[PDB]
Every structure is written in structure tokens, then in C-alpha cells.
Amino acid sequence: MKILKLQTLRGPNYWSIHRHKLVVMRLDLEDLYEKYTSDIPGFYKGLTEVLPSLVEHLCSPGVKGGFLTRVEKGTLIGHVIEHVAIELQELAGMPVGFGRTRETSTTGVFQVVIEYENEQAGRYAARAAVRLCQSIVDTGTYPATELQQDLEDLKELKNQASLGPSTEAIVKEAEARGIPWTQLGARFMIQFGYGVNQKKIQATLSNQTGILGVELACDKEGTKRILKDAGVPVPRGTVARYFDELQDAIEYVGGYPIVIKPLDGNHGRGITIDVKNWQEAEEAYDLARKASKTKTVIVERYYTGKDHRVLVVNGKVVAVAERVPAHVVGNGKSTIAELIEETNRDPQRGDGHDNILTRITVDKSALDILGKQGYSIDSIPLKGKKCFLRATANLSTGGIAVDRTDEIHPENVWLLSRVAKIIGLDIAGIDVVTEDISQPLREVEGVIVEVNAAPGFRMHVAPSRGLARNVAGAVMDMLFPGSKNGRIPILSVTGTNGKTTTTRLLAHIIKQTGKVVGYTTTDGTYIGEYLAETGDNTGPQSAHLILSDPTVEVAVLETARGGILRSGLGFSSCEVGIVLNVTADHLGIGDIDTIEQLAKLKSVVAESVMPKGYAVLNAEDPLVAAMADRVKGQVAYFSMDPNNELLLRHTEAGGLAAIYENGYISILKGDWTLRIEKAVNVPITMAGKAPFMIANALAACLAVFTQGVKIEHIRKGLSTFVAS
Amino acid sequence: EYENEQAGRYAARAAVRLCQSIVDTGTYPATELQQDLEDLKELKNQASLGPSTEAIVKEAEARGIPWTQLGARFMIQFGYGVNQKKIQATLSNQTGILGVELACDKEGTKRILK
Amino acid sequence: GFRMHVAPSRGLARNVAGAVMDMLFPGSKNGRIPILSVTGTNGKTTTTRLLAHIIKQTGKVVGYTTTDGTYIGEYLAETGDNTGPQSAHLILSDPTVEVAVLETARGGILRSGL
Amino acid sequence: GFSSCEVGIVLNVTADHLGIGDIDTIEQLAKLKSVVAESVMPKGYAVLNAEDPLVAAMADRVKGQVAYFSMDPNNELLLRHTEAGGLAAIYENGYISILKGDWTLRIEKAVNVP
Amino acid sequence: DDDD
Amino acid sequence: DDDD
Ligand SMILES: Nc1ncnc2c1ncn2[C@@H]1O[C@H](COP(=O)(O)OP(=O)(O)OP(O)(O)=S)[C@@H](O)[C@H]1O
Ligand SMILES: Nc1ncnc2c1ncn2[C@@H]1O[C@H](COP(=O)(O)OP(=O)(O)OP(O)(O)=S)[C@@H](O)[C@H]1O
Ligand SMILES: Nc1ncnc2c1ncn2[C@@H]1O[C@H](COP(=O)(O)OP(=O)(O)OP(O)(O)=S)[C@@H](O)[C@H]1O
Ligand SMILES: *N[C@@H](CCCNC(N)=[NH2+])C(=O)O
Ligand SMILES: *N[C@@H](CCCNC(N)=[NH2+])C(=O)O
Ligand SMILES: *N[C@@H](CCCNC(N)=[NH2+])C(=O)O
Ligand SMILES: *N[C@@H](CCCNC(N)=[NH2+])C(=O)O
Ligand SMILES: [Mg+2]
Ligand SMILES: [Mg+2]
Ligand SMILES: [Mg+2]
Ligand SMILES: [Mg+2]
């Protein structure tokens, strides 16, 4: 047991396509190379007692317990290590269902490929599987304490590398719409789309959310002043820094009752709702000042009515939720003492940051509130009527949300949209206190309490007493208005011998159109006319630089075999995928020992072409031409021999080929021939003396033609491109 | 005519007191005159924008673009209705929260730029 | 702060405020919306409401202030007299108003001007 | 009168006026009315009554997406269609609702529809 | 702060 | 902070 190499693949790869996240391990089996499980005494029993859940694994037999039957028959341990890694990272709550094992050319090393949901979790599971299997083959069993330690480490790794619920909702919507998404490395920011079409979100703030609006929302008094200047019904009140100002502030609001609350507070930190006398007023001021970080508090008039949260996205009301505080109803002739834990036994109850409906937490503050309620633990509710536990009405404590989106008055919708626009927030959460959201806020004495930037919408996607609202869908609609993804044209060039020249020629041709081209070659990564980065810059680590640049409109990526083998492709799909040739020259590196394996590896580019894209293949190369099948999207052939039977048959039914017919670089669009240049006026061809350069020019011209680039631009770019 | 509202009101209130003191006693104390001038200078300083806001507002006035002072956070609003913009000192209403927060983070900015 | 660019002290000053205002208002465009001020002795409210209705026939959001109250589009934004500049600011600062129609009584002009 | 339609709606097929032309069986009538459903372009939609077995049988041999409408909200075929995909319409609780998969969008109370 |  |  020695781990030679541990690679992680993040995109389409040699092992699979549509299985982007994989881990590949080179495992040495020095002393246990060619002995089966049946040859190992007690291995099956120890394995099946350490991990009984392996009984679920449907192997190639395809029946329940098929993997266990295979273990009974006796096979190599690579398969069982794959299976135990899969089950080990699946027991931690990460469902994975892909695995492979292969014997390498070298005498002892195997290759094990395991699907993962989390990169660190997948690597840790791969590392733990070999230790578990070695311990079973050495001692016949694995300690349960070590199994629990590994499982809890996997769970901790999963939790650590996890987004917050708003971010999964938005990312899942983007995935459903086919919008590419990547994780930036600065502040848990997510980038959607590519190049000039990209957007950024953190949790709910987008890259278009204004600093001024966010900072105004966080200022309670400033928000109240601005809304009052706009005619919005805000509560009447004033600030009071010291104790001596309490009276003078109380007579300002217009009598009793009043509300006392800190201005540097959130989530109800030390806020008192209802007070009707001076003793309550002074206790309230003291408590709020203790909760205040700057010893400053606000008094205001108390407004009766239910508390509603209104979500406004892109100036439109998306969801309205009424927040009912923790309460119990004794319609079953039962008192609070039973219902407090009767509700706690509901499977809907859940702590943490995933389950929104938090269990009813009975604290000493809650005991004080229920003492103020006027009833006791064993006081049966009258007539089976709602009796409350607190007044903050927050889901973080055990309250509930009721969907009211379909009941809001149109005038209220207009007013709340206007409020969101006045504050200056693209996504806003407005807190309203009103007796009836179905009536305008002027008839009833409804008020706008506060406006929150970056609101959480987990209460709107699971109201628990109404219809869920597609908030993430509205956010994605705001970010990408039409049926538009954030993609830019991507041209991925692969092949054994002409990648760099073709990539540079493609970039030069596209530069003729007024577009900024970001292209990576072996020489370095360029954006437009300037060098963005030096070095090799051929793997996905340089593709991310191009795809994340806010000025790049078209990406041209040289995709060598090394990057695909090491970490797969840097993108899920490409608009154009060019395969120039496949020749067995540098053979034996990695697990690539046959030219068929090299063709399979280079076919990843061709197979990753989107259904609306094009695969530009060399019809003259049999291995490259064989990639015509298993390709989604159209196929365009290029050939230095104009009499290629496959190319001619392809052009007869359809078209889109490129040939070198009579000293001419020509595009065949079916029955039509469009000549670009005489191939002696193209400098790189060296007056037509370099057939390789002519083939590269053919591929580049066909690739740009498939994307609608006009013939004159292709001609100018081909004539002005100098070999360098 | 005034340049600052509070300063103009204070000058109007002080002028009648100065004239009444002159008619009653024949002169005005120099200490009271200096106190009034210091109060006027303090009023001018208090109700003053910053040089960045001053320059931007002067350019907007030179271009004939209306400008008003919002009462919340020293924000200046240019234009009217749907055609309005807002600035504080150099931040505009189109300046992003994410960009500002990333710029304030030294290590995050270095990582992103690298 | 561009305070060092508008007065380098060892080179040419740069018009930073001009660049900021170009960013805020790209073309030769001010931030103005069409303003229609109705004044007179006896027909201000009726004319203001009729103008608001006529412009509403065009697909435009009309913010108009009359004696009855201040309206934006079809909805009442504020009650009261609302015929002075203190109510004109509400219309002119609203982010959704495209055309402003203001009833300008002599009382507001006398009190605080236009 | 057209080669293709963006939306093809089939409401119901009832064997009432049989015998006209060569149409003598309700299967022939369903085949005749299925011309509209089969003329929907691949990017188009076929709106079918899931509550009608003959109309629901037109789900196959249709190019383009299929959207079901049912007066019974518990139609098993409609629910199965919404679970994998969406785009259905039901009358659930005094409500004309659109099912977009797992999302319910209510339009009107069906008593406010004249 | 965050998810207000 | 402010006018950096
Ligand atoms: N003037 C008021 N009149 C009536 N109810 C009020 C008033 N002020 C606050 N409330 C209620 O008290 C709740 C909390 O008030 P907030 O000022 O929002 O306190 P907080 O510190 O902001 O806590 P969060 O983050 O808003 S839940 C509101 O959601 C209302 O239900
Ligand atoms: N289509 C072609 N077929 C065969 N040989 C070619 C072809 N195009 C170029 N060559 C030869 O291969 C050499 C290197 O090609 P380049 O395109 O510059 O490098 P490359 O294809 O990027 O290879 P790497 O893996 O990136 S170093 C050229 O100098 C030619 O001699
Ligand atoms: N052009 C006019 N000439 C004379 N009287 C008019 C005219 N237009 C309207 N009136 C009458 O004047 C009355 C009051 O004028 P209104 O247009 O209703 O309001 P108003 O002109 O704004 O008065 P104020 O300034 O608000 S008190 C109307 O009810 C009409 O009877
Ligand atoms: N809800 C949250 C938003 C404050 C601004 N957020 C960031 N990231 N600057 C809050 O703190 O109230
Ligand atoms: N409210 C926010 C918090 C989770 C994301 N925060 C961090 N630090 N990852 C959310 O997205 O729910
Ligand atoms: N330069 C200044 C910018 C901080 C963001 N400004 C405001 N008003 N939030 C800084 O503090 O570095
Ligand atoms: N840096 C900034 C300071 C003026 C704005 N601040 C206040 N309190 N008015 C500036 O405008 O230069
Ligand atoms: Mg808050
Ligand atoms: Mg709140
Ligand atoms: Mg190269
Ligand atoms: Mg009037």
C-alpha cells in the first residue's frame, strides 16, 4: 500500500464526460498484487462487518448485493477499495455513484477513479479507503473508533466546503438554466458566465448592488428620513442617547404605547416591543442600551398589526411572508406543557443553517415572556386559541412564516417597489407592520419598519403554511434577463502537432472583427494585443484567467493532452472544438500507452462540443475522423486532399467542409465553393511550400466560418498573419 | 443675498442687533463683532461640502445639471426623476458593494489580481 | 480623493470632475425630466389634473402635485395641500417619475420661491 | 393553412357529429384532430387535455414540448409530467394555477373571472 | 449581517 | 476611510 499520485479532475476528462468531479489515484499493490479476496483469510467477514452498507452496491451483476457476491467469488482489491471509498464518502451524506479501476502498463500500479462531491472530502475518502483495506487484510477488522473518526472528519470536510442556503439556491437555478458558475477565491464570491457577460454574487448581493443603497439601508434613521421625505408611512419616533431624554422623546411620539430599540442592533438584539408605563420604559432603555454597541437607542410609536417580510427583486415584489412568533394552539384540549415538546417532535424541526423551522427554544427569557403572557405552563388555552411564546417573530427561534404573496394589495405592491427603488437596492427585504396586507397601508395604519440589504429568502422558498416562491429564479432573471446564459464563444484547439499555430491564427482572424480575443497558447496567455501571462499556460489554470477576464469576448484555448490528463477540461462545453491530428510520438507518459488511448484522450475536446456547436475534424486522419460519431452538434471536416471520399459524402448531404483544391483554401457549404485565398498570398504557408501550415490555415478558416465570421475578415486575417 | 442658509439667517439677525447697539450707545463692542464673525465662519464651515463633492457639484452646475442635497448621508442627487444619479463624495449610486469590499480587503484583492 | 490630480503642483491639472460627470451623464444629456408648472388664480388644479391625464395617455409615469394631494402615476403619494416646493421635491426626487406636473400657487412662491 | 404552428391546442374529442366525410369512428376523429398537435414545431408547444384519454394519447408522435391542462388537480398523468419537467395547468383550490414543475403560480380565484 |  |  503506497499512494504514488493523487490527481483531481474538475471538468470533462479522459475517464468520463458529464462526470466532471473525479479523483484518480495511482495505488501500488507491492505484496498483494495478484491475490483475490477469497485468498485473504477472513477478509470478507471483516469487510462486511465494518461496512454493512456495501450490501447496497449494485455491481456489474446489477442485483442487490452483487458486489458482495463478487467479493465472495474473489477479485482484485482495487475494485473493493474503489467501492469502500465510494461508500465511505456516501455515508457522510455525499451521494456518489461512479467508480473505475484499471491495470496500468507498469508491473504493480493500479489506477482507481472515484466520483466525489467535495474535492477535499473525495481525496480524504480515497486516502482512508486504502488504510481501511490494509487494516482489514492485516488484522481482519477495522476499529469502530477509527471508522467514526473518519466519518466525522468527512462530515466536517463536507460542512466546511459548503455554501450557504441562498447560494445553493441561486447556483442550482443557474445550473438548471445552463449558466456556467465558478467559485472565486477572495470572499466566497460566485461568478456566473464568462468574459464580458459575467456577473458576481456573494450571497444575495450582486455585482450591481450599490454601496450607497446598502449603506443607507443599514442606517435606520437615514432610511426613515429618506422614506418620510418620499411620503412613505414610516413609524413616528426619535433617537435618545441619554437617560434624561426619555420623557422628552416619549411626548414627541404622541403618547403610549411606544417601542424602545437599539440602532446598532439586528435580529432583535435587545428590542422591547410594547411598553405602557415608565418602569417598563426605563427597564427597556437599560436593556436596549446594554444590547447597544454605541449606547444609543431609538424610541418610536408602537403600531399594532402583524409583521410581514416583503422580498423585492429587480423592483418587483416576488414574495410576501407574514412572520408569526412561536405559538401553540390548544384545540386538542392540551396545555402548553405537552405542546412545547409535541411540536419539538415534528420532523420539520431542525437546527443549524439548513432547516429553516427551528425547534421551540425555551429559555429563561422565554419563561419571562410567557410569564408576562398572563398564563402558565399548565394553563390550558381557551377555546383552542393561539397563545404565543414571544414577540420577536423570527424563524431563528421557532416562529413560522405564512405566504401572503397572492393577497397583497396592488397599491402596496407599487409602494414597496417604490421604496426599494428609493433606497437603491436591487434585492431588498422590507419589514412591514400592518393589520391587513390585502388593504392599502393608508387605510390601516401600516408602516415600513426597516429595509434590509442582502436578505435571506429561506423563509420564502419553504413557507410551511403556503406556496413556495421561486426566489432564485427571480434572481437569475434579474442577472440574466432574457433566455441568455453568460457564455462567450469558446474555441478549444487540440491535436498533436499544430495547436499553437492554429490558436494564434484563430485569434488573429477573430481580431479582424472588432472583438477582444483572449487566447492561451504555449508561448503565453494573451488578452487582445497585450500579454496577460508568461509561461506554458495551456492547462485549465490559464483557461480560468481568460474566462474570468471582464473584457474578453471570445476565448481561444490551446488544450494539450497534459492538462486534460492532469485535471480535465477548464470548461463544461465549447462552441467550437478543433482536433487537428493524432500521432503517436510522445507515448507512454501517464497511462497513455496506445494510440487508441491517445485518440480517446484527444476526443474529450470533440465530445465536449455543445449541441449547437461544431467539431472541426481532420478527415484525412482516420483516428480523428473516427470521432465523427459520439459528438453532439455538427461536424465540419477539413482535408488537404480535395478528393477525400468522407469529406465529399459529408458535403453532398449538408456541407461545411474546407479543402485545398487548386492552390486555393476553399470552404464547401454543400454544393457551393467559396475560395478564400490563393495559399501563396498567405505568408505562413511560405508560398505554399509548407503543407502543415496550409492544413492549420484550413482548420482555422473552417472554425471561424462555422461561427458566421464574414469571408472578407477571414481573408484579411489570413493575409496579414505573419509566422512568429 | 446669502451663500449659506444658517449663515444668512444669522447675519440678518445680527445686523439689527448691531444697528440697535450703535444707535443706543454710539458703537459696537469689538469682542461681540469678533464673536459674530467667528460664529459666521463656523456656520460656513459646518454647512460645507468636501473638495471632491465641491468639484463634482461645480462641474454639474457648469453643465446645467440640477443638483440637490439629500438629508440622509451627505448624498447629492443629480437630475430629476428616472434620470437621476447619486454621489456621496466619490462613490456613485452605480458603485458596487462587492467591489468596494474587495478593494478594502488587501489579501483578497492581492489574491484576485494574482 | 482626486485632490492631488486637480492641483498637481508639478504638472498639468486634470479635469477629474469632468470625467466623473461624463461617467454619470454620458452624452450631452442633463438629468432633467419634462417639468410643467401651472400657475394662475382660478384654474390650477383642474388644468394640472387634465395635463396629468393627457400625458398618462402616453405610456409615461406622471408625477403631479395639486391642491388635493401629490400623486405618482395612478396612486396617491401624499395627502394635504402640497402646492409648494416641499412637495415638488417629492415628485422630482422619485426614481419612477418621467414627467412632472406641478401646481404652483402664489403662496409657495412667496414663502420659499420655486 | 400553415406548415407549422407555435402552439397547438387540443381541447377535447367527443364522438358527436360522426358520419360526415370518411370520419365514422371516434378514433378517426381523434386522428383528424391530432393534425394540429402533430403540426407543432419542435420549438413549439402542444397544449393537451390530460383529462381526455384520446387527447392525452396524442402525447406521443408530437414534435416539441407537451403541456397538459386538467380540471382535476389529481390527474396522475399531469402530476407525473410536472414532476419530470413541468408546464401544466390545473384548477386546484378555486384557483387557476400554472405548474412549472415544483412551483405553483396562481392567476385568479376563478370567481373573479367573469 | 448576511442573510438578513 | 473616506476620500482614500
Ligand atoms: N415602531 C414599531 N411599531 C411596531 N412594531 C415594531 C416597531 N419597531 C419594530 N417593531 C417590530 O419589531 C420587530 C423587530 O424590529 P427591528 O427594528 O427590525 O429590530 P432588529 O434589530 O432590526 O431585528 P431584525 O433584524 O429587524 S428581525 C419588527 O419586525 C416589528 O415586528
Ligand atoms: N498540422 C501539422 N501537422 C504536422 N506537424 C505540424 C503541423 N503544424 C505544425 N507542425 C510542426 O510542429 C511544430 C510545432 O508546432 P506548434 O504548433 O508550434 O507547437 P504545438 O502544436 O503547440 O506543440 P506543443 O505540444 O504545444 S509544444 C511546427 O514547427 C511544425 O514543424
Ligand atoms: N379659468 C378659470 N377662470 C375662472 N374660474 C375658474 C377657472 N377654472 C376654474 N375656475 C373655477 O375656480 C374654482 C377653483 O379653482 P380650482 O381649479 O378648482 O383650484 P385652484 O385654481 O388651484 O384654486 P386654489 O389656488 O388651489 S385655492 C373651480 O372649481 C372653478 O369653479
Ligand atoms: N442583512 C445584512 C446586510 C448588511 C450588508 N452586508 C454586507 N455584506 N456588507 C445586515 O448586516 O443587516
Ligand atoms: N446568510 C448567508 C451565510 C452563509 C454564507 N456565508 C459564508 N461565510 N459562507 C447564506 O448564504 O445563507
Ligand atoms: N477609502 C475608504 C473606502 C471605504 C468605503 N467607503 C464608505 N463610505 N463605505 C476606506 O475606508 O478605505
Ligand atoms: N473625503 C470626503 C469628505 C467629505 C464628506 N464627508 C462629510 N462628513 N461631509 C470628501 O468629500 O472629500
Ligand atoms: Mg435588520
Ligand atoms: Mg427585521
Ligand atoms: Mg505549443
Ligand atoms: Mg387648487
Numbering used by the authors:
A (entry chain C): 1 to 724
B (entry chain A): 115 to 228
C (entry chain A): 456 to 569
D (entry chain B): 570 to 683
E (entry chain J), F (entry chain I): 1 to 3, 5
Show me the paper's own sentences about this structure:
In the cryo-EM map processed with C1 symmetry, all the TeCphA1 protomers in the tetramer bound a cyanophycin primer peptide, (β-Asp-Arg)4, on the surface of Gcore. The cryo-EM map showed a clear density for the C-terminal β-Asp-Arg dipeptide unit (4th unit) and the other Asp backbones with a hook-like shape. Since the Arg sidechains of the 1st and 2nd units were invisible in the cryo-EM map, these models could not be built in the substrate-bound TeCphA1 structure. Since (β-Asp-Arg)4 is well accommodated at the binding site of Gcore, a cyanophycin molecule with at least 3‒4 dipeptides long seems to be suitable as a primer peptide for TeCphA1 activity. In protomers A and B, Mlid and Mcore sandwich ATPγS, and Arg731 and His748 in Mlid interact with the α-phosphate and γ-thiophosphate groups of ATPγS. While ATPγS was visible on all M domains, (β-Asp-Arg)4 was not observed on the M domain of the substrate-bound TeCphA1 structure.
Cyanophycin, a nonribosomally synthesized polypeptide consisting of equimolar amounts of aspartate and arginine as the backbone and branched sidechain, respectively, was first identified in cyanobacteria in the form of opaque and light-scattering cytoplasmic granules. The discrete active sites of the G and M domains are used for extending the Asp backbone and attaching the Arg sidechain, respectively.
